[PDB]
Amino acid sequence: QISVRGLAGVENVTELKKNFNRHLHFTLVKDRNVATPRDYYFALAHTVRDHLVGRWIRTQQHYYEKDPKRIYYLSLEFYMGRTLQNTMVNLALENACDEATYQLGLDMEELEEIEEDAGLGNGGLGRLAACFLDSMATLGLAAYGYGIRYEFGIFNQKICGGWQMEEADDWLRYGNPWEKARPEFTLPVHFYGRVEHTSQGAKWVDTQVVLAMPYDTPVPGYRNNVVNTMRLWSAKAPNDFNLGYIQAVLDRNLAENISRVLYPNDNFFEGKELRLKQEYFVVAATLQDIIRRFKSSTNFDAFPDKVAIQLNDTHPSLAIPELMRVLVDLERLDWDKAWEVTVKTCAYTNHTVLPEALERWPVHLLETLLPRHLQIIYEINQRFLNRVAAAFPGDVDRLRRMSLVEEGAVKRINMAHLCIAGSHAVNGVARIHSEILKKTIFKDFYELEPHKFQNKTNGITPRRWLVLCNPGLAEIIAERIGEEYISDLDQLRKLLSYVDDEAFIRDVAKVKQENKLKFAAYLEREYKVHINPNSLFDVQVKRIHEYKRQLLNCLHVITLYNRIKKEPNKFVVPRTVMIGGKAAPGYHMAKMIIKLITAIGDVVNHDPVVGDRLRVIFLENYRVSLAEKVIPAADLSEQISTAGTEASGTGNMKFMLNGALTIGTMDGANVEMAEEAGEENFFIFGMRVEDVDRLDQRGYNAQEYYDRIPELRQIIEQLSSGFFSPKQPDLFKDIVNMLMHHDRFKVFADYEEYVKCQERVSALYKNPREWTRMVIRNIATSGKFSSDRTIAQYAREIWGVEPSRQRLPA
Amino acid sequence: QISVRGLAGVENVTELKKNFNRHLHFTLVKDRNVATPRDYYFALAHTVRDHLVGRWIRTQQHYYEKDPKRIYYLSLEFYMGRTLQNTMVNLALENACDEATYQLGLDMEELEEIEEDAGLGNGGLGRLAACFLDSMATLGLAAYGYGIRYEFGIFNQKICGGWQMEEADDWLRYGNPWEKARPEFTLPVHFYGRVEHTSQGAKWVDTQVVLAMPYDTPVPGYRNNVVNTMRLWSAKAPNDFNLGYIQAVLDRNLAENISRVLYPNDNFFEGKELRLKQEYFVVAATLQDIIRRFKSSTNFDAFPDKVAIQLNDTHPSLAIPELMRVLVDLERLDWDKAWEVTVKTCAYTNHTVLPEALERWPVHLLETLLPRHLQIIYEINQRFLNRVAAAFPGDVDRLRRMSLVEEGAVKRINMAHLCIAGSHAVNGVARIHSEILKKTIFKDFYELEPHKFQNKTNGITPRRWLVLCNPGLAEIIAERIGEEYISDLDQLRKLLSYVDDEAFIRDVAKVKQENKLKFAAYLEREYKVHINPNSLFDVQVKRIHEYKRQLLNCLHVITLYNRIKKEPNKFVVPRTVMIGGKAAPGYHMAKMIIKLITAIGDVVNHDPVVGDRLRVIFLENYRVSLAEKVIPAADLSEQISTAGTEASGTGNMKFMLNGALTIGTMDGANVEMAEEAGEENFFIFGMRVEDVDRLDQRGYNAQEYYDRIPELRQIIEQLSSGFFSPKQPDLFKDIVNMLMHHDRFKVFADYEEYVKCQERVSALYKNPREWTRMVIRNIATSGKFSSDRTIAQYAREIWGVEPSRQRLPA
Ligand SMILES: O=C(NC(=O)c1cc2ccccc2[nH]1)N[C@@H]1O[C@H](CO)[C@@H](O)[C@H](O)[C@H]1O
Ligand SMILES: O=C(NC(=O)c1cc2ccccc2[nH]1)N[C@@H]1O[C@H](CO)[C@@H](O)[C@H](O)[C@H]1O
Ligand SMILES: O=C(NC(=O)c1cc2ccccc2[nH]1)N[C@@H]1O[C@H](CO)[C@@H](O)[C@H](O)[C@H]1O
Ligand SMILES: O=C(NC(=O)c1cc2ccccc2[nH]1)N[C@@H]1O[C@H](CO)[C@@H](O)[C@H](O)[C@H]1O
Ligand SMILES: *Cc1c(COP(=O)(O)O)cnc(C)c1O
Ligand SMILES: *Cc1c(COP(=O)(O)O)cnc(C)c1O
């Protein structure tokens, strides 16, 4: 149908049809008489999967022959989403499969909706890992993603009586065609025990053993015949575990619980033992795998020349002391040499400056679970602090600030401090964030070792986030500038010479309208909710957090409602306000915010005077597959975090690429997005980082804003009096109390500028031609935010490897 | 190589080779450079599996079109063993696969040894179910085996310091190519809750739900293109289960523990809640499946015309009240009609008369777990006892004897009584056993309903137990009488005209010698134990039980040792005495018996004066795959249970078919085996059932035998003094105490006759020609003991269906 989806050659279509029928018969044990849509999905998945095999085997043997430096990306989260369409896109099989299925009497888009998301992440950090894998394969790097195969990913969200309910994400129930179990490569992981000091160094003895069984998933590059590997570890009990008899067999569950479920708390670090076990589990199994592969190429001087380990936050930070443990205790290297190798091997990426999110493990937990690692951490700390003392003589407070060990009621290990000490490179994820790290939380470390600190601005893959989710836009771009931009996104700059092109203006607006119509139809069919497709689609989708200020959006919504009620017969630009995202199960305030959004909808959506001029919808179960639907449909992207709190954001980049305009603060990557597009093409409002600092020095008094802004006062009175909860008048008392007395994120301080800025959005939307021209200026300058750019920078500036767009033979 | 293994056609071999290579590549994601023997096994399994698919689909659609009466075989145990060779045998693919693999540079026999046994049973009862499935498919019956997919089967046995150690049988670790998961056919099973009595009958409410997910395994008939199904249920938690958050997800393990492990206690009924859950789990899921299939052919009058349910012991006895529950509470049938349907549908097979093995469930357990079923059981009991009272007026003691409810400290439900009341047919498993049921434990029930009581003598499948395990014997038989005997075992009678045939005598002896050489080589390679292949192979393999009298065998072994020590320079017929079998983990005496056997070996095997004249070996980890190796190698089959205790035995039949002579009591099927072969061709010794009864009336005094038999006295003195345990002199005090004071199975009473009979065995073995002639007379009369005969009798006399050897189109 469309060019970017590839060729549907007669020979290919014929072969796909027969292989589909072969799998339906031999693999699924079904015929066309009893087969269901799910059976058809699986037949197609197996058919497409077959095309990966040759490339997967030959990519891996190519790495063995050429022996390049290997990149190991360690993460507790990989937010992959669906695999079928992405695989077809990267193999140029989409049109051929569409034709093959069509000739068999099937709708491929219907089959695609059957696949479960691989939801092995919470949000941004997990999705970044996924985009990175796609980019590393596209750029021909010898890269491996290592993580945990959770039996249950991020919970499915149900909304019941306006409240979030959590249900288990049983994503493996029907099987996973994309993984290959590798039981033959199972490795042991050790826990508990004790340290014995002998004549020839320390020995870690009397341990309990859990087995790590790998499952491999192919990661195809974009049309370069490269297929890399994501290896996820699953926990298995040894066969003599607990070996009255029945109970011993049942108790195997305790060991296997390590890989059972993803921790869904992305707001607040909780020092839970099971989480610590998960972190060591992935680190210990992965490092054994790395060392084995290195030995199968005695001398560890060349280790950092052949191995790079990237730590996705501090979650896999135990890699540092584990590598030291193996090198010192098992390989018998001297400490100084092992440390040199470790530092040159490891690099650390930070994703937030919020203090409550930072990992600070109680010493007593590490003492019991990982006694040798604690001893190694203590030794690292002493040697590090001796360096600090030598560089800054007499600065005793610096010594306590920089220590890996934090004193207090309970002693804790600061895992970020461990990561900085043990890595040759530390990076933030957007320019402003990286600067904040050097000026604030890691200031002391920057002063000691300035060369370690870098920036790597985040990005998104244009395969999933344009070609896959928005083929209509990809095609109209391809018609003008060709197909090369898909792996070279900077080429989008060529679209600037089309800003006054009448045909292109019409085509861009048409694609958006089609996407909006499709999403409006999705909402009616799956949820029975009615929306006006002609309204401005105002979208805020992301995890629910106070710092992300969904509450500020709520205040604007109520403002618009109140203004309509005051002047009913005055024209306003119609809006559909959509808010979606999951709340961490133990985050009370976030759960209250969800209830508020639904409560506002209950009032607004049923007011006859409002009509179709304002609609408020909570998008249930926001996840990767839903993002792929809603982002192409969006007109306005809400990126409204308090300046200095969102490290980067990546949803922002997805919206920019797909033809939405952005209303945002100068926070995270918003700054660079505005820099690329031009400030005149961005709806920028509110306090800058410097303004927040000034307010903190003075003291934030929310009462001041309440007293001076009548429209804000009305909203607070409505919330407190029970206007949005008639049967439970004091339901939102916690929200009001927080806003008035304990608001860390200064919601009231940005209220006036936000509402005014929103008025300017509505003004521009009244002029469809000028709206679309500004959209074109955004899409055309989105090139910097390709994860291909991000990965090329990691490769050149941290890992010491050169990317390549050269094809492997098919 | 050999005729019975089929043709190796050029076209077939070529196609098998290419499909092997296709699976190694696409399915296993390997090439010949990195593939291991295990990978090669899996490639072959997938290749052979492909040949089942068409036949499996067309068999099932054939049953849908013809709509014959369906047979449902309900069992908690299916002892299947390995599947690869059996599938090849039944599809006539063995020679072709042998050639295909040979041309690829692989030894098929080496690949076959990689497959894990499906050890989903304890012994005889579980293996009977497996042989029955094979026979039902071979006889063209529309039959379904229903059971539980245990994650862990019967434990692997390790011998450490002479003691049994148990380790988990993790049989699914590398995957199971023979099962097809059917998640789409998942059904709910209900537990706990309470009964509510409304205007329109009882309702079972407030239950907890566990899901039953089926896995289907193909059961191929012998070269008739029939492929039936074994459906095994796996336990799954519902997605809202327990739905702080983390714990709720982890707690899903509690529901899923239902299908975790096979109970290994085959000696003593233990009223454990988890076992009760397993029994209801299989019954509830199965009956829903049956009713659904019946409705997809309103009127349940035709139910017994279309459905037969066979209960393998009382383990699935809850089928009776569950069927009543569905018919009365859900379908709204009146009680009397539902009861008529139930009785005509169900039949019960008993497997033991030992009181401690009979299921007697505490009422309090059923009250809590299955409150509606208990109410139904009470109603069944009242109506049944009203019938007893009408037939035998004034016989008050008969009423308490026949009650389903047993009074005492704790009230219990006798599940055997439930089965008899609710079944139209009750059978024992050998003629003597069936007679014992009518004269003793079920005497009252036989007097009330004599027409219900039947015999169905057990059998074994000649596919697994001759063609598969002993191809050399199968071939020499086939050379004389053709191939038809494999599905018509009565044809073996034709071999009687070869008893004086010099060529056949030589061929039978040669095959035995080859089998003995092969097994002697197996013992050296896998266990490093040395045996003399020229010695008489004296074998007792079966689960360790006091009633099976491994201890009597032990006494004979020590007798032979003592006689050698007394007269060292006298010739004795050399023997290798092999004893193998698992003990239930909580059966102390059985564990002591294993230790005794190894302790005897430790003394006997290292005595220089003995030399190679006597060797005692404990065969570790006895299981189906090991039985297939040792049985063909055996000269003497030990079947020495106390008369009246072994219901049938089936190991006895396996040995008879494979050219061993039998030393045995007149117990179980031994009686019929001796009847078929002629008593002159069997080594029969010891008390008959009548002799045991006489001794019980008088009182068994072991001291009498000890006082009157000097050779027995010596052995007891050796055991007590610490001759077989020098460092732990009183190790065997428990065994001596039991034998002297508390022996339920009268070991001493059969000692003298046993030793004398064993002397006659040795005498015959000195004459190779006459030994072999007697062997021929045994093999030639083994035909009755085909499970094809057994199943034909069940079909005609219980199920009301006619078997067929007619082929389905390929
Ligand atoms: O597709 C699958 N087929 C079989 O397991 C199967 C076909 C067949 C034919 C005859 C006899 C036995 C047979 N068995 N299995 C799925 O293969 C998926 C993709 O690898 C797995 O994720 C999933 O766990 C597994 O259920
Ligand atoms: O997604 C992020 N963090 C987590 O998911 C997270 C789970 C967790 C568990 C325990 C302790 C800490 C934890 N954190 N950070 C995002 O990471 C994205 C990728 O850099 C950024 O764009 C975005 O600004 C940032 O908020
Ligand atoms: O044989 C199997 N192959 C795969 O799972 C597989 C091939 C492949 C190629 C590219 C990308 C992904 C891929 N995945 N799976 C086994 O299939 C067996 C037989 O059905 C199962 O018992 C067992 O659980 C399962 O591991
Ligand atoms: O194998 C048998 N029984 C069991 O495995 C068994 C497990 C179990 C658990 C709880 C309660 C009772 C239990 N029992 N019985 C054999 O069943 C065989 C098949 O009929 C006979 O040949 C043989 O004589 C007989 O001993
Ligand atoms: C991109 C993405 C995110 C990250 O969004 P931010 O707005 O940058 O926090 C979270 N969840 C999903 C499903 C995503 O796709
Ligand atoms: C046949 C068989 C049995 C039953 O043997 P009996 O001697 O009849 O108790 C037990 N275990 C296995 C593995 C068998 O094959």
Swiss-Prot record, chains A, B:
Site features described as Involved in the association of subunits, chain residue numbers: C97, C131
Modification Phosphoserine, positions: S3, S403, S487, S720, S721
Residues flagged as site, Can be labeled by an AMP analog: Y144
PTM per Swiss-Prot/TrEMBL: Phosphorylation of Ser-3 converts phosphorylase B (unphosphorylated) to phosphorylase A.
Protein origin, superkingdom: Eukaryota
InterPro entries membership: Glycg_phsphrylas, Glyco_trans_35, Pyridoxal_P_attach_site
Gene3D superfamilies hit by this protein: Glycogen Phosphorylase B (3.40.50.2000)
Quaternary structure and interacting proteins, as annotated: Homodimer. Homotetramer; to form the enzymatically active phosphorylase A.
Protein name listed in UniProt: Glycogen phosphorylase, muscle form
Organism: Oryctolagus cuniculus
Gene label: PYGM
